[PDB]
Amino acid sequence: MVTFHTNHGDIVIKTFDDKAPETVKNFLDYCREGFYNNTIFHRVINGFMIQGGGFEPGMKQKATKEPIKNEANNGLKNTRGTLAMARTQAPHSATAQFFINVVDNDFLNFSGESLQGWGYCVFAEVVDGMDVVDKIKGVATGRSGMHQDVPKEDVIIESVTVSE
């Protein structure tokens, strides 16, 4: 288990260690190294997802490790409350950024090992604090440089605690 301590409340998640082993290891290493301390949910789209783990306040992107393999061919679906890895168009490009699905986002799901099919790798699920996720997803947002859906007030991941 892992708890995001945000300035809107605690989000408790259970990792899917068997189904996305490299994603979960990559995630837990960032957690333990403090990488997510004082990052924000920088992209918030109600009825879609909330995305964070990349930027400090002022959209100062953090330096990351080399990207990880996409494990979305594990068959796990981007249903409400699941966590998945954000990434660019390249399927195996994900680094630290993740998002929480706030609806069932069936269109994000793996359908084939290809550009358009690879989809987004689910690696954990919220087990407590979906109320906090539902508060964050509804905050006011706006533009910030080349970025859209940036919360007008920072939604800050203050720190992460690991439970074993």
mmCIF file of C-alpha atoms in Angstrom:
data_model
loop_
_atom_site.group_PDB
_atom_site.id
_atom_site.type_symbol
_atom_site.label_atom_id
_atom_site.label_comp_id
_atom_site.label_asym_id
_atom_site.label_seq_id
_atom_site.Cartn_x
_atom_site.Cartn_y
_atom_site.Cartn_z
ATOM 1 C CA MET A 1 0.000 0.000 0.000
ATOM 2 C CA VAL A 2 0.895 3.600 -0.667
ATOM 3 C CA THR A 3 -0.737 6.822 0.586
ATOM 4 C CA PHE A 4 -0.582 10.126 -1.287
ATOM 5 C CA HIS A 5 -0.870 12.844 1.366
ATOM 6 C CA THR A 6 -2.351 15.708 -0.670
ATOM 7 C CA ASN A 7 -3.495 19.134 0.432
ATOM 8 C CA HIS A 8 -7.050 17.879 -0.209
ATOM 9 C CA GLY A 9 -6.724 14.670 1.877
ATOM 10 C CA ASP A 10 -5.234 11.180 1.754
ATOM 11 C CA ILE A 11 -5.475 8.862 -1.257
ATOM 12 C CA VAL A 12 -4.648 5.255 -0.356
ATOM 13 C CA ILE A 13 -3.751 2.878 -3.178
ATOM 14 C CA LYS A 14 -2.976 -0.828 -3.527
ATOM 15 C CA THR A 15 -0.348 -1.703 -6.141
ATOM 16 C CA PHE A 16 -0.792 -4.512 -8.683
ATOM 17 C CA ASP A 17 2.652 -6.066 -8.172
ATOM 18 C CA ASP A 18 1.935 -9.285 -10.118
ATOM 19 C CA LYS A 19 0.260 -7.678 -13.140
ATOM 20 C CA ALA A 20 2.606 -4.691 -13.687
ATOM 21 C CA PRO A 21 5.855 -5.627 -11.918
ATOM 22 C CA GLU A 22 8.173 -3.136 -13.651
ATOM 23 C CA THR A 23 5.619 -0.308 -13.384
ATOM 24 C CA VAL A 24 5.052 -0.973 -9.685
ATOM 25 C CA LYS A 25 8.801 -1.137 -8.929
ATOM 26 C CA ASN A 26 9.421 2.083 -10.888
ATOM 27 C CA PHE A 27 6.545 3.788 -9.007
ATOM 28 C CA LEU A 28 7.656 2.513 -5.441
ATOM 29 C CA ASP A 29 11.295 3.716 -6.172
ATOM 30 C CA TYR A 30 10.046 7.214 -6.983
ATOM 31 C CA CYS A 31 7.880 7.119 -3.846
ATOM 32 C CA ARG A 32 10.747 6.081 -1.589
ATOM 33 C CA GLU A 33 13.181 8.571 -3.120
ATOM 34 C CA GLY A 34 10.790 11.438 -2.355
ATOM 35 C CA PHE A 35 10.279 12.153 -6.051
ATOM 36 C CA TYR A 36 6.574 12.893 -5.625
ATOM 37 C CA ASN A 37 7.087 15.156 -2.587
ATOM 38 C CA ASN A 38 5.807 18.612 -3.555
ATOM 39 C CA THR A 39 4.648 17.609 -7.013
ATOM 40 C CA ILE A 40 1.165 18.579 -8.170
ATOM 41 C CA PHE A 41 -1.812 17.231 -10.040
ATOM 42 C CA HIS A 42 -1.055 19.455 -13.030
ATOM 43 C CA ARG A 43 -3.735 18.114 -15.410
ATOM 44 C CA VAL A 44 -7.269 17.728 -14.085
ATOM 45 C CA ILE A 45 -10.186 16.903 -16.396
ATOM 46 C CA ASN A 46 -13.510 16.212 -14.640
ATOM 47 C CA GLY A 47 -15.250 13.159 -16.015
ATOM 48 C CA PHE A 48 -11.903 11.861 -17.276
ATOM 49 C CA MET A 49 -8.908 11.699 -14.913
ATOM 50 C CA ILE A 50 -6.487 13.563 -12.657
ATOM 51 C CA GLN A 51 -2.794 13.430 -13.549
ATOM 52 C CA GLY A 52 0.271 14.300 -11.532
ATOM 53 C CA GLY A 53 3.681 13.219 -10.356
ATOM 54 C CA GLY A 54 5.741 15.283 -12.779
ATOM 55 C CA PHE A 55 5.690 18.978 -11.972
ATOM 56 C CA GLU A 56 6.491 21.164 -8.992
ATOM 57 C CA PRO A 57 4.490 24.355 -8.337
ATOM 58 C CA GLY A 58 5.098 26.753 -11.201
ATOM 59 C CA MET A 59 5.155 23.800 -13.670
ATOM 60 C CA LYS A 60 8.841 23.089 -13.046
ATOM 61 C CA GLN A 61 9.193 19.602 -14.487
ATOM 62 C CA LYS A 62 11.261 17.230 -12.390
ATOM 63 C CA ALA A 63 14.180 15.271 -13.808
ATOM 64 C CA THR A 64 13.260 11.605 -14.255
ATOM 65 C CA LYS A 65 14.867 8.213 -14.785
ATOM 66 C CA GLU A 66 14.838 6.377 -18.106
ATOM 67 C CA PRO A 67 11.308 5.384 -19.200
ATOM 68 C CA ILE A 68 9.660 2.038 -18.441
ATOM 69 C CA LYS A 69 8.105 -0.641 -20.605
ATOM 70 C CA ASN A 70 4.357 -0.416 -21.122
ATOM 71 C CA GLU A 71 2.739 -3.304 -19.213
ATOM 72 C CA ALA A 72 -0.834 -2.574 -20.363
ATOM 73 C CA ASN A 73 -0.975 -5.974 -22.113
ATOM 74 C CA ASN A 74 -1.746 -7.282 -18.620
ATOM 75 C CA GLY A 75 -5.474 -7.082 -19.410
ATOM 76 C CA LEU A 76 -6.343 -4.723 -16.519
ATOM 77 C CA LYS A 77 -8.921 -2.068 -17.537
ATOM 78 C CA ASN A 78 -8.900 1.696 -16.897
ATOM 79 C CA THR A 79 -11.983 1.517 -14.677
ATOM 80 C CA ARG A 80 -12.898 4.235 -12.189
ATOM 81 C CA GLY A 81 -10.406 4.473 -9.361
ATOM 82 C CA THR A 82 -7.554 2.622 -11.103
ATOM 83 C CA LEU A 83 -4.129 4.229 -11.484
ATOM 84 C CA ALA A 84 -2.353 4.142 -14.843
ATOM 85 C CA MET A 85 0.893 5.552 -16.231
ATOM 86 C CA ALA A 86 0.790 8.785 -18.200
ATOM 87 C CA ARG A 87 3.086 8.825 -21.255
ATOM 88 C CA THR A 88 3.707 10.446 -24.627
ATOM 89 C CA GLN A 89 2.761 8.905 -27.983
ATOM 90 C CA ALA A 90 5.589 6.346 -27.664
ATOM 91 C CA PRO A 91 4.072 3.389 -25.763
ATOM 92 C CA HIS A 92 7.240 2.702 -23.741
ATOM 93 C CA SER A 93 7.842 6.351 -22.799
ATOM 94 C CA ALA A 94 6.286 6.555 -19.298
ATOM 95 C CA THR A 95 8.476 7.859 -16.471
ATOM 96 C CA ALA A 96 7.014 9.208 -13.231
ATOM 97 C CA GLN A 97 3.663 10.708 -14.225
ATOM 98 C CA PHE A 98 0.505 8.754 -13.395
ATOM 99 C CA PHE A 99 -3.229 9.379 -13.470
ATOM 100 C CA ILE A 100 -6.317 8.195 -11.592
ATOM 101 C CA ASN A 101 -9.333 7.348 -13.763
ATOM 102 C CA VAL A 102 -12.438 9.054 -12.326
ATOM 103 C CA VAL A 103 -14.816 7.280 -14.738
ATOM 104 C CA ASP A 104 -14.485 4.022 -16.660
ATOM 105 C CA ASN A 105 -12.172 5.168 -19.498
ATOM 106 C CA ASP A 106 -12.608 2.191 -21.798
ATOM 107 C CA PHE A 107 -10.880 4.029 -24.690
ATOM 108 C CA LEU A 108 -7.579 4.039 -22.689
ATOM 109 C CA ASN A 109 -7.452 0.222 -22.641
ATOM 110 C CA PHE A 110 -4.819 -1.936 -24.336
ATOM 111 C CA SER A 111 -6.104 -3.415 -27.585
ATOM 112 C CA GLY A 112 -2.897 -4.437 -29.384
ATOM 113 C CA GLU A 113 0.868 -4.052 -29.390
ATOM 114 C CA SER A 114 0.935 -1.078 -31.731
ATOM 115 C CA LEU A 115 0.982 2.749 -31.666
ATOM 116 C CA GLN A 116 -2.790 3.124 -31.388
ATOM 117 C CA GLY A 117 -3.486 -0.117 -29.551
ATOM 118 C CA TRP A 118 -0.990 -0.099 -26.710
ATOM 119 C CA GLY A 119 -3.087 2.040 -24.418
ATOM 120 C CA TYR A 120 -2.340 2.961 -20.832
ATOM 121 C CA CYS A 121 -0.952 0.603 -18.226
ATOM 122 C CA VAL A 122 -3.051 0.085 -15.080
ATOM 123 C CA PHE A 123 -0.819 -0.693 -12.094
ATOM 124 C CA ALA A 124 -2.785 0.138 -8.927
ATOM 125 C CA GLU A 125 -6.181 1.071 -7.538
ATOM 126 C CA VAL A 126 -7.528 3.507 -4.955
ATOM 127 C CA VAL A 127 -8.716 1.573 -1.884
ATOM 128 C CA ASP A 128 -9.498 4.592 0.330
ATOM 129 C CA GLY A 129 -9.884 8.285 -0.390
ATOM 130 C CA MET A 130 -11.940 8.183 -3.577
ATOM 131 C CA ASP A 131 -13.739 11.142 -1.965
ATOM 132 C CA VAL A 132 -10.482 13.109 -2.138
ATOM 133 C CA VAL A 133 -10.030 12.096 -5.792
ATOM 134 C CA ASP A 134 -13.592 13.256 -6.497
ATOM 135 C CA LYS A 135 -12.843 16.637 -4.841
ATOM 136 C CA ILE A 136 -9.627 17.116 -6.830
ATOM 137 C CA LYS A 137 -11.254 16.184 -10.151
ATOM 138 C CA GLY A 138 -13.771 19.020 -9.671
ATOM 139 C CA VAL A 139 -11.394 21.913 -8.898
ATOM 140 C CA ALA A 140 -11.201 24.945 -11.192
ATOM 141 C CA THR A 141 -8.528 24.797 -13.897
ATOM 142 C CA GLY A 142 -7.012 26.949 -16.613
ATOM 143 C CA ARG A 143 -4.119 27.526 -18.974
ATOM 144 C CA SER A 144 -0.472 27.683 -17.886
ATOM 145 C CA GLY A 145 1.981 28.168 -20.725
ATOM 146 C CA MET A 146 1.491 25.305 -23.168
ATOM 147 C CA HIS A 147 -0.481 23.336 -20.546
ATOM 148 C CA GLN A 148 -4.246 23.020 -20.213
ATOM 149 C CA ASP A 149 -6.439 21.876 -17.322
ATOM 150 C CA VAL A 150 -3.939 23.171 -14.754
ATOM 151 C CA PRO A 151 -5.629 23.711 -11.357
ATOM 152 C CA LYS A 152 -5.870 27.419 -10.573
ATOM 153 C CA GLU A 153 -4.928 26.548 -6.973
ATOM 154 C CA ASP A 154 -2.195 23.962 -6.649
ATOM 155 C CA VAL A 155 -3.320 20.454 -5.783
ATOM 156 C CA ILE A 156 -0.123 19.382 -4.048
ATOM 157 C CA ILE A 157 1.108 15.884 -3.303
ATOM 158 C CA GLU A 158 2.851 16.813 -0.069
ATOM 159 C CA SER A 159 4.414 13.361 0.382
ATOM 160 C CA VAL A 160 3.902 9.621 0.086
ATOM 161 C CA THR A 161 3.925 6.957 2.792
ATOM 162 C CA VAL A 162 4.397 3.258 2.065
ATOM 163 C CA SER A 163 2.641 0.551 4.120
ATOM 164 C CA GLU A 164 3.763 -3.103 4.229
#
